[PDB]
């Protein structure tokens, strides 16, 4: 049912709810949200993240996500 | 790099809701009502033996918080799922 994962954003598709993580799909649904804002708009490719969700087909659902702020810096460059 | 922003990792040893402190790995920080996740202050969630990943903006007297992470070390992890097919 849960899981978590660490990895690099390589494409995020807003208007599908869907995210590119190590090139494995996730849905990252609007109520995934952190200070009043849905994390799918703060992410972008580059971005070096840890998550965690439940597990579901035939893509599992990402519920928190944070940005490594030091690293995703690191990995554009 | 940005001298007004910190981000860290470390353990969880004691949380003040009253004085809206967190205590990692003996420091102190200040984690306010409005660093919330998912409708829910992170204040409330965080306890003594969480993991944690964390960042923010310095500030007196403690620095502040405004995005924290909780790893879910007891959940299926996708680095195992990885080692065991490899
Ligand atoms: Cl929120
Ligand atoms: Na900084």
Known sequence: ???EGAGVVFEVQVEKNLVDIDHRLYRLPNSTVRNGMPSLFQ???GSVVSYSGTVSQPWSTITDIY???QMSEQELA
């Open 1 to 3: 049912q849960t899981f």
């Open 43 to 45: 992410v972008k490719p």
């Open 67 to 69: 940005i490594h702020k």
